[PDB]
RNA sequence: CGCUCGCCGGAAGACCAAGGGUUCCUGUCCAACGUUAAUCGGGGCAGGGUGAGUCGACCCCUAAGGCGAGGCCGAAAGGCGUAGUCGAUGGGAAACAGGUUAAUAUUCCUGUACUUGGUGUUACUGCGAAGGGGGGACGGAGAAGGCUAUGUUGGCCGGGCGACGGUUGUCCCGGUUUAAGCGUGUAGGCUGGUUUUCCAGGCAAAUCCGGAAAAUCAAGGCUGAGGCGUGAUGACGAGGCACUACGGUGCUGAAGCAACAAAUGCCCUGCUUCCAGGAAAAGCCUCUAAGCAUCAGGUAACAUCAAAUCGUACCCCAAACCGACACAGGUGGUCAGGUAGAGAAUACCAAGGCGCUUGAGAGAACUCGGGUGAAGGAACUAGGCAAAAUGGUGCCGUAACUUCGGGAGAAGGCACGCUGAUAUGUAGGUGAGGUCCCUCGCGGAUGGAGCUGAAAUCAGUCGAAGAUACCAGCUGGCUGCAACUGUUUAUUAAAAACACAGCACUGUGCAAACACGAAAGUGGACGUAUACGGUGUGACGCCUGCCCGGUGCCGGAAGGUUAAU
RNA sequence: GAGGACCGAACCGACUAAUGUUGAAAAAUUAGCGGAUGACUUGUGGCUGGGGGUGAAAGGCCAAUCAAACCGGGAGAUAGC
């Protein structure tokens, strides 16, 4: 079948909520 | 591990089913808003 | 009697049991039982309206006759029985016409004793009479406050009231807290005092012994956050506040009786 | 006792399978596609009246419709009911 | 496909529920999908496949809880709740074994059953409920005994006679299966039995239940595994044999016993014991009332018919479910063989299932994961972190302190293999035929073959080492804190924090205080001051000093001030 | 033959270390670790709803979201930045 019926966008963002170590003061 | 969605049709149809939506005023407004949108499936039912 | 347990464990060391060999070793009388399901402290709205309730052992409600309306019919106490729904023990009596009832157990009451309700009975523990016929100073229990309603006063395990005076259509009773309270003399009362008077001597010993009575743990308001209890937070152990309920109403002394309908029947509040 | 025009509407089609033909040769069982609301009594009444034979026991099942993808969409075939009519000893059709 | 090899085997196997929804099977294709190739696939495509009186749902019955006629409340929406009606995760009804398909089977087929309901005769006939009473019907733990599943060995039966020494023996391999149902009714367990009279009980009224005496017998009834008969000269059956593509299908088919050890399964919803005192309703049995007349029903046997309708394929510790994935995770119940072992641990295996969907080389550093080390032994480091070590059973032995229980496996020793005898296998366990008596049959007493079998001591022996693997405690001393078990920041904090039993103070007289709620109402509680709520403290031991000015609370109300009016 | 007794699997947890950190995994693996007849654990239903619940109390949890969930609306809030 050389028809090309492709797919689409099929879920959103899990997490950009990511690592956070690194400071200069507290 | 244990994820948030553990399916059960009985707990589904008693929460979001058609008769659960048609029991209250605010669920018949849900079904009114889903006919007014044009939704294919109205509830979770079939 | 009371008996201290041998400390073979922590949680067994401080236990004091209150054993009664006079109690029935068997299943209770089945017609006088009833399903008693727990609440959790939850009302019909489903919200907790009384904290620290929940869990515990399954209990079946025993229908106890507090009214004692079988007047003039002699009964005989078949056996004393444990009741998980109250502090006293209960007495399966059997009237002469073949009806079994549950009454509260008086102090001097054993199996094989006679009891008799009615105004023409004798003055002995287990007999129920209206207080026009009971002599003054008699220790009585299971006292009705309204004539024909059922006993409400003096019903816990080793409790009693004294008919300390009587004139007119009103006796006046010294209740177990020290309150002198007037009650109309047509109310019934059982003679003697309630029987399980060794109940205040038992020690639970361990935390789960309270847990299998249905008493969930009490979180101390000072150990909470300011959002939860008016006893706030604080960096460390701080108090600095007058002690209050979780809803900001002052404990440690503030009187909360406001009932102007029944204070005409109280002649002296408790000391 | 079933009305006659009801019996003329339950037997849809004789079903050919090579399991159905094994049942016809070895257990005297014709396998019919029937109507969806067919009861085992209505099939028994219709095989006897319309095929002019005798029937011992009708066994039925409901075949689920396969989901197929014709072109680019997702269709679903119809559920259909399938009887297993066991004739007693004399076989006509 | 084959032959090896490795791996799992309390699972990585078999099977249900959930959830999914055709992934099942077959023939086809190999674009994409599949972390590579693919002829293969849970991919594409087209067929095929799910068979029920008995299994499940439906159904009858209710629990929590929902909804709730009237009802009570509430600006409205609506909240609550009575009758009632729903709601399983519980209670009610009945099938097993072989055979079968490429794929379905307690469903199909053979065999043998069984359940409920509608319908046709007998004698003696009182049958009859939105009612009464039974019953259903219920906890934790513990202890056996009786078994059985199952296993193990012997016997029997079929076959073998050894690719390298030996192997016609006390050899080797394999099999030695069979159910519901029906019959009998015993190991057990429960319980006095029966008539007769009377009555303020069970709203009635009851010949039932409960009560009360009274005669007569405790010798009566329920209950209950498992056996043993039947089912069954049947089925199944190791293996040969035409069959024949030797796959496979097809016809045959011998033995089919016994002893011992056995559950966590059954007897048992029992028994004993504890306190924390352990659903409900129907089906069921039974009593009658209104009713009802050789009507209507009931009862028995016999005969007929009826048992609908849905689900039924497949996955289920998973590539089909939940995790975006063919995802090292999560996921209820059931079954659970051998050899060691206390064991569902562990090691190795069976039945069974797989080798985890990129390989081939090479044998640098470095990094993971391990192994081993001279001499030293904590010198490392924030810190014995990590690793090493300890580890079993029996016996001897064991301190301060102690709330007298503990500490305690304190510490610390020693004995362990194999062979032989004691004893051709003991102590025990089991138990045959035989003997003997009866209430003579699933007996009882004795009997003691057969079978099974520790443990111990002497002696001998082997090795560097005998709990040889896996498995499996490091120990002690002095202190802080918290009595303790427990709980806690899902996802950087498990603690000294929280809880706690106890303690005290305080409120609270029941239409309780409190709480939820504009309310009704409901929790508290079907409880009632030996009870409940709130607060603080936190076992236990010894204890709890002084201050009432401030701030609260409590009590007083003469005065001063003071609202609406 | 008791026990919030002891040892120890299932089970429930989560103390330590290493790995992992564009992971096999949006919290896991591996080796040890604590509880394991109970204040246990688990299934299936139910019930409590957002200034609200529930909390052996951490501001914990309430659908990978929590010192006030999510969705839609006011709404193109306002924003001397």
């Amino acid at each position: 079948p050389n028809l090309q019926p492709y797919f689409s966008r099929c879920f959103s963002t899990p997490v950009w909520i990511s690592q956070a170590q690194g400071i200069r003061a507290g | 591990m244990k994820r948030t969605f553990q399916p059960s049709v009985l707990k589904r149809n008693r929460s979001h089913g058609f008769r659960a939506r048609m029991a209250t005023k605010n669920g018949r407004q849900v079904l009114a808003r889903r006919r007014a949108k044009g939704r294919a499936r109205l509830t979770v039912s079939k | 009697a009371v008996v201290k347990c041998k400390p073979t464990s922590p949680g067994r060391r401080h236990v004091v049991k209150v054993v009664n060999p006079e109690l029935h070793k068997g299943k209770p009388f089945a017609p006088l039982l009833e399903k008693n399901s727990k609440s959790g402290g939850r009302n019909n709205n489903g919200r907790i309206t009384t904290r620290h309730i929940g869990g515990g052992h399954k209990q079946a409600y025993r229908i106890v006759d507090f009214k004692r309306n079988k007047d003039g019919i002699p009964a005989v106490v078949e056996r004393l029985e444990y009741d998980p729904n109250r502090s006293a023990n209960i007495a399966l009596v059997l009237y002469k016409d073949g009806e079994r009832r549950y009454i509260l157990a008086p102090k001097g009451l054993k199996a094989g004793d006679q009891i008799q309700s009615g105004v023409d009975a004798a003055i002995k523990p287990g007999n129920t009479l209206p207080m026009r016929n009971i002599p003054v100073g008699s220790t009585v229990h299971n006292v009705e406050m309204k004539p024909g309603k059922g006993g409400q006063l003096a019903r816990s395990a080793g409790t009693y009231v004294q008919i300390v005076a009587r004139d007119g259509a009103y006796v006046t009773l010294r209740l177990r807290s020290g309150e002198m309270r007037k009650v109309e003399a047509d109310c019934r009362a059982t003679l003697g005092e309630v029987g399980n008077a060794e109940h205040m001597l038992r020690v639970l010993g361990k935390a789960g012994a309270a847990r299998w009575r249905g008493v969930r743990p009490t979180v101390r308001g000072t150990a909470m956050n300011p959002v939860d209890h008016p006893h706030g937070g604080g960096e460390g152990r701080n108090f600095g506040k007058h002690p209050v309920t979780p809803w900001g109403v002052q404990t440690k002394g503030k009187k909360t009786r406001s009932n102007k309908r029944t204070d005409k029947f109280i002649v002296r509040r408790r000391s | 006792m079933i009305r006659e025009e009801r019996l003329l509407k339950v037997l849809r089609a004789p079903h050919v399978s090579e399991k159905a033909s094994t049942a016809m040769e070895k257990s005297n069982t014709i396998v019919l596609k029937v109507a969806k609301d067919a009861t085992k009594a209505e099939i028994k009444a219709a095989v006897q009246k319309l095929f002019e034979v005798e029937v011992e026991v009708v066994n039925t099942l409901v075949v689920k419709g396969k989901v197929k993808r014709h072109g680019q969409r997702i269709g679903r075939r119809s559920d259909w009911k399938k009887a297993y009519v066991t004739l007693k000893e004399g076989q006509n059709l």
Side-chain angles (χ1 to χ4, degrees), chain D residues 1-2 6-7 10 37-48 55 58 60 81:
Chain D
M1 67 300 297
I2 318 287
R6 166 66 190 164
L7 296 185
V10 289
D37 61 308
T39 72
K40 278 170 194 192
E42 285 183 356
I43 301 158
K44 171 165 187 166
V47 180
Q48 281 173 121
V55 173
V58 179
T60 62
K81 197 157 181 179

Side-chain angles (χ1 to χ4, degrees), chain C residues 50-222:
Chain C
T50 317
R51 320 187 295 177
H52 323 122
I53 300 179
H57 209 287
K58 195 188 209 326
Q59 293 164 350
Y61 185 73
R62 276 77 169 165
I63 304 169
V64 179
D65 185 349
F66 302 100
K67 299 192 182 163
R68 313 268 304 259
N69 309 313
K70 298 282 288 298
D71 295 76
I73 295 180
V76 52
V77 181
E78 284 193 353
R79 51 181 185 248
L80 297 206
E81 295 205 6
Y82 174 88
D83 195 0
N85 314 277
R86 68 199 69 249
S87 202
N89 301 123
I90 48 171
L92 186 63
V93 312
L94 165 69
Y95 291 92
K96 194 162 262 291
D97 42 24
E99 162 171 24
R100 269 173 196 87
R101 288 259 181 93
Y102 271 144
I103 65 159
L104 254 56
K107 195 180 189 185
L109 190 80
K110 73 200 60 58
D113 273 27
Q114 303 177 241
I115 60 146
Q116 196 198 345
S117 165
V119 311
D120 57 332
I123 312 297
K124 55 186 283 292
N127 283 20
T128 291
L129 293 102
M131 290 164 168
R132 313 197 165 275
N133 306 105
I134 303 191
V136 167
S138 281
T139 171
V140 288
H141 73 271
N142 199 23
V143 165
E144 319 182 331
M145 325 166 93
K146 279 199 176 187
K149 177 178 179 171
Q152 295 174 296
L153 296 145
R155 276 170 31 157
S156 183
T159 47
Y160 60 100
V161 309
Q162 299 270 141
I163 316 183
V164 301
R166 167 188 101 218
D167 196 52
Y170 277 112
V171 305
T172 167
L173 319 158
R174 192 196 321 260
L175 312 177
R176 187 50 182 150
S177 61
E179 191 158 298
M180 295 279 218
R181 150 79 171 241
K182 261 178 195 140
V183 151
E184 38 191 348
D186 282 6
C187 293
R188 290 163 178 271
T190 318
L191 269 303
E193 82 186 14
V194 199
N196 199 352
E198 297 86 8
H199 169 89
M200 62 161 179
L201 258 58
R202 59 137 177 78
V203 189
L204 300 188
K206 70 174 206 183
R211 291 301 314 269
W212 56 60
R213 289 157 149 89
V215 194
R216 305 206 49 240
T218 309
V219 196
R220 231 156 70 242
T222 183

Side-chain angles (χ1 to χ4, degrees), chain B residues 29-43:
Chain B
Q29 291 194 346
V30 161
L31 299 190
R33 281 194 319 258
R34 289 181 83 83
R35 294 196 189 101
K37 215 202 194 200
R39 285 272 188 194
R41 38 189 71 86
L42 209 64
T43 49

Side-chain angles (χ1 to χ4, degrees), chain C residues 257-271:
Chain C
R257 163 179 185 87
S258 84
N259 188 16
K260 302 174 201 146
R261 189 197 70 247
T262 48
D263 58 347
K264 61 169 101 73
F265 304 111
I266 288 93
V267 306
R268 206 183 66 191
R269 293 275 280 149
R270 67 188 151 89
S271 282

Side-chain angles (χ1 to χ4, degrees), chain D residues 15 17 19 40 59 64 66 69 81-82 84:
Chain D
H15 179 74
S17 160
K19 179 190 189 195
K40 278 170 194 192
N59 276 21
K64 307 302 178 292
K66 271 169 177 165
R69 274 79 43 199
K81 197 157 181 179
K82 166 205 288 182
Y84 276 92

